[PDB]
Amino acid sequence: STQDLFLPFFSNVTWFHAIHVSGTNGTKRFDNPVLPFNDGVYFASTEKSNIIRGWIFGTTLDSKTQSLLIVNNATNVVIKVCEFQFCNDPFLGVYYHKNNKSWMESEFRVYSSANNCTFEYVSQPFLMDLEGKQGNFKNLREFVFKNIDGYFKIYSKHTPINLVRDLPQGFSALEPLVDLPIGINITRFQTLLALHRSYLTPGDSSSGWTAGAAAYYVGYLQPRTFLLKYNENGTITDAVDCALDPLSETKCTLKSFTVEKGIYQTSNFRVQPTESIVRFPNITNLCPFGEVFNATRFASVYAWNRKRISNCVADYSVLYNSASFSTFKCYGVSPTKLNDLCFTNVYADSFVIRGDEVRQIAPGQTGKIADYNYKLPDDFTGCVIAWNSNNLDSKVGGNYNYLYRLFRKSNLKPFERDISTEIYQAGSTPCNGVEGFNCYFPLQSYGFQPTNGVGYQPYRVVVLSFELLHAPATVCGPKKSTNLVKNKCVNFNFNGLTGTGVLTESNKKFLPFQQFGRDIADTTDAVRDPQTLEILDITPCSFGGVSVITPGTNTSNQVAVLYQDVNCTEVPVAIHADQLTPTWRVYSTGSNVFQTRAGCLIGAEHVNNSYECDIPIGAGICASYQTSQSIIAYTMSLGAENSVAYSNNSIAIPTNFTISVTTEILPVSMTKTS
């Protein structure tokens, strides 16, 4: 058993052709595209005229990066590594022209230039020749190219075939051919073909390249575990991929290509949590933002009304999405994500100002309003929300019930409010208590009238300011809390308790102070959701193993799969749907799905009849292969029914006898090793 990059058995690989169908109604195919290298490439070619001539490997296939070139031109094999400037359609140009004599190759159009050469080989043949015979593809060549830890390995095999299409069903191992110590980073590769000049091709004279009948197949290796069979001479005469079907896995586990009748545990299946769950206690009682926002009375800008918010949770998504506010400026903070954080001090300042003055309510703004009526700090993580109020703050005759402060000794500090009747006096022209020259009262009249323009209409502005303190925060927004999912395996995190299980409705009655739930083994059994108070149970995910019920490979290769201790609905979720397409999902689900007490049985047909137990499944259920033939699961019969004819005066005296010899085997000793 070897774990290495292999081509999975019964895979489905790409097919390429290079052929010009006779006549103008046919197809002119020159398949030679640049293909990814992946972690390994399997290359096969069925040919009779030897159109294939080599390969190209590299990352960009240009002078930018190093590349590897392999070509054979009917008497040599050349391997080179250079920063070749490959053509977009490289090939070898065969020519029927009699320049010297016979067919020859004369148009080497693979690469424009070779630079920064590292090494070159002139190794001996893959010959092959320049012959153009027809009929069936008489040779089959298989190659495996691998590039690992700075070494490039090439395996190859050559066999004669009598096929005309597809690949033979025979089995053959590809012996190593060459290994190269190259640190190149192969990622894309391309195929080289020997084209024929239509200008100088037998019968054809039109300008162009024509390709003879050629067919090659490309596959990609994957990391697989294979069970290879070495014969007396060391040749790999057979192999088994340990991923193809349950029978293959059973053979691989038993390390044998022949499996006897019985049930074998091959692997263990686990159901992973779907995506996630995270939960913390959502929120305390809502804060009274409506009072400030929908306040019956609003104070002047110089006397903005402040409401302190504490012992609650901020919530404004209902009004934010309404889009009913003319301004929702949140400076330096997301308009919604700010709520998800603890805030020790929260304030709501409401005032009525002119529409043009709303722009002055910004952190760090300076002016006759910001520096004298409402000053915001630079560290303003709050939001200033302004909306028109002409429908309430306007009437016939106008309103004259507002004041604003314009004169003061110094600019106001952030969240600084001061109301006084002291008369401001100029330094050079003091008044000493009177409103004289260069002396003005701090407050000035202010108001609105219906005739005012849009920019001059009243606007209600509410500022929700937040600041952090060392003291514990009361207005806090919860951390990432997702929605609850039930009856579905998932990885949950309840207030720091990380667990994986299935959340379901529970009838257990906790206590008001109880959150967790435990069993005799001190394992989390039930949990209470902190956001909303209800009790949910915790259950393991699936656990359980996988057993491959099968008769002997001799007789039939049909098998059945048993998944212990799981409902028959979770079988495809146990990391299934990723195995081999045509062999595993058939046993993953389908018809004849039976729910035994020992687990879920698939591939076996339940039968009313009861027979002698053939293969023990468990809980009185046994499986047999005999009935067209198919695996059947039944309740084993504990022998044939009988009822002795008993009466008070009847006896049975035997009239004949049989001398029966029976064999008993008893181990007497085990090998005495030291």
Partner 1 sequence: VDCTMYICGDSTECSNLLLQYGSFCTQLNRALTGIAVEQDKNTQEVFAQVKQIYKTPPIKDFGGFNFSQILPDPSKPSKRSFIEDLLFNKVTLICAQKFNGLTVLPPLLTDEMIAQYTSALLAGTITSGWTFGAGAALQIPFAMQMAYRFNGIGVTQNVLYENQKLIANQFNSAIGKIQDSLSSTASALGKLQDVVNQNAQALNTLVKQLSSNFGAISSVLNDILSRLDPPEAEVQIDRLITGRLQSLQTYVTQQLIRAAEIRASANLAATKMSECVLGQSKRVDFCGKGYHLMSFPQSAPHGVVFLHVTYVPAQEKNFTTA
Partner 2 sequence: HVQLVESGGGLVQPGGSLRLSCAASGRSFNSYLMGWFRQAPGKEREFVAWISGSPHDIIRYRDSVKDRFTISRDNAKNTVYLQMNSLKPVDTAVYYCAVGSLRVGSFSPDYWGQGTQVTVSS
Q: Are strands 399-405 and 497-502 parallel, antiparallel or unpaired?
A: unpaired
Q: Does 520 bind partner 1 (CB under 8 A)?
A: yes
List the x/- string, 207-226, binding to partner 2 by CB under 8 A.
--------------------
Q: Does 415 bind partner 2 (CB under 8 A)?
A: yes
Using the minimum distance from each CB to partner 2, give the nearer residue, 136 or 334: 334
Q: 491 phi and psi, to 5 degrees?
A: -90, 110
22 binds, among partner 1, partner 2, none (CB under 5 to 8 A by kind): none
Longest dimension (CA), the chain: 151
Q: Are 345 and 414 in contact, with CB atoms under 8 Å apart?
A: no
Site for partner 1, residues 529 to 548, rule: CB under 8 A: 539-540, 543-545
List the x/- string, 551-590, binding to partner 1 by CB under 8 A.
-------------xx-------------------------
Tell me how far, at minimum, the Cβ of 520 lies from partner 1, in Å.
7
Alpha carbon distances (Å) from 530 to 152, 280, 339, 578:
59, 6, 19, 38
Q: 81 phi and psi, to 5 degrees?
A: -130, 115
Token couple for 26: 């046919």
- Three-state secondary structure call for residue 400: strand
- Three-state secondary structure call for residue 534: coil
Which candidate, 386, 272, 377, places its Cα nearest to that of 329? 386
520 binds, among partner 1, partner 2, none (CB under 5 to 8 A by kind): partner 1
Q: Does 318 bind partner 1 (CB under 8 A)?
A: no
Rounded to 5°, the CA angle 179-184-189 comes to 85
Separation of alpha carbons 490 and 511, rounded Å: 26
Q: Does 424 bind partner 2 (CB under 8 A)?
A: no
Place of tokens 């303003």: 380
Separation of alpha carbons 377 and 345, rounded Å: 14
Site for partner 2, residues 361 to 400, rule: CB under 8 A: 363, 376-381
Separation of alpha carbons 664 and 649, rounded Å: 39
Separation of alpha carbons 186 and 146, rounded Å: 9
Tell me how far, at minimum, the Cβ of 119 lies from partner 2, in Å.
18
Token couple for 535: 């009790």
Tell me how far, at minimum, the Cβ of 673 lies from partner 1, in Å.
8
Q: Does 262 bind partner 1 (CB under 8 A)?
A: no
Token couple for 84: 């070749």
Q: Does 344 bind partner 2 (CB under 8 A)?
A: yes
469 binds, among partner 1, partner 2, none (CB under 5 to 8 A by kind): partner 2
Tell me how far, at minimum, the Cβ of 640 lies from partner 1, in Å.
5
Burial class of residue 40 in the structure, from the number of CB atoms within 10 Å of its CB (0-12 exposed, 13-18 middle, 19+ buried): buried
Range in contact with partner 2 (rule: CB under 8 A) among 177-185, 337-345, 350-358, 660-668: 337-345
- C-alpha radius of gyration, the chain, whole number: 44
Burial class of residue 603 in the structure, from the number of CB atoms within 10 Å of its CB (0-12 exposed, 13-18 middle, 19+ buried): buried
437 binds, among partner 1, partner 2, none (CB under 5 to 8 A by kind): none
Separation of alpha carbons 48 and 564, rounded Å: 55
Alpha carbon distances (Å) from 302 to 361, 445, 592:
12, 12, 82
Using the minimum distance from each CB to partner 2, give the nearer residue, 338 or 538: 338
Tell me how far, at minimum, the Cβ of 339 lies from partner 2, in Å.
11
Site for partner 1, residues 478 to 507, rule: CB under 8 A: 498, 500
Using the minimum distance from each CB to partner 2, give the nearer residue, 465 or 624: 465
Q: Does 333 bind partner 2 (CB under 8 A)?
A: yes
Which candidate, 475, 459, 458, places its Cα nearest to that of 316? 475
Tell me how far, at minimum, the Cβ of 513 lies from partner 1, in Å.
24
Select from 335, 414, 436, 499 the one that contacts partner 2 (CB under 8 A).
414
Tell me how far, at minimum, the Cβ of 523 lies from partner 1, in Å.
5
Separation of alpha carbons 330 and 314, rounded Å: 15
List the x/- string, 631-650, binding to partner 1 by CB under 8 A.
-----x-xxxxxxxxxxxxx
Tell me how far, at minimum, the Cβ of 417 lies from partner 2, in Å.
12
The count of C-alpha atoms lying within 13 angstroms of the C-alpha of 5, restricted to the half-sphere facing its C-beta, is 16
Separation of alpha carbons 204 and 208, rounded Å: 10
291 binds, among partner 2, partner 1, none (CB under 5 to 8 A by kind): none
Q: Are 171 and 238 in contact, with CB atoms under 8 Å apart?
A: yes
378 binds, among partner 2, partner 1, none (CB under 5 to 8 A by kind): partner 2
Select from 3, 523, 554, 629 the one that contacts partner 1 (CB under 8 A).
523
Range in contact with partner 2 (rule: CB under 8 A) among 87-95, 107-115, 409-417, 426-434: 409-417
Site for partner 2, residues 434 to 473, rule: CB under 8 A: 465, 467-470, 473
Site for partner 1, residues 360 to 399, rule: CB under 8 A: none
Q: Are 274 and 490 in contact, with CB atoms under 8 Å apart?
A: yes
Q: Are 256 and 274 in contact, with CB atoms under 8 Å apart?
A: no
Select from 337, 368, 518, 597 the one that contacts partner 2 (CB under 8 A).
337
Separation of alpha carbons 307 and 290, rounded Å: 11
Separation of alpha carbons 42 and 14, rounded Å: 11
Q: Does 238 bind partner 1 (CB under 8 A)?
A: no
Residue 515 identity:
Q
Using the minimum distance from each CB to partner 1, give the nearer residue, 346 or 566: 566
Using the minimum distance from each CB to partner 2, give the nearer residue, 369 or 546: 369
Select from 104, 341, 439, 593 the one that contacts partner 2 (CB under 8 A).
341
Q: Does 334 bind partner 2 (CB under 8 A)?
A: yes
Using the minimum distance from each CB to partner 1, give the nearer residue, 287 or 548: 548
Binding residues for partner 2, per CB under 8 A? 332-334, 337-338, 340-342, 344, 363, 376-381, 413-415, 465, 467-470, 473
Binding residues for partner 1, per CB under 8 A? 265, 268, 270, 272, 498, 500, 519-523, 525, 539-540, 543-545, 564-565, 597-598, 613, 616, 618-620, 622, 636, 638-654, 664, 666-670
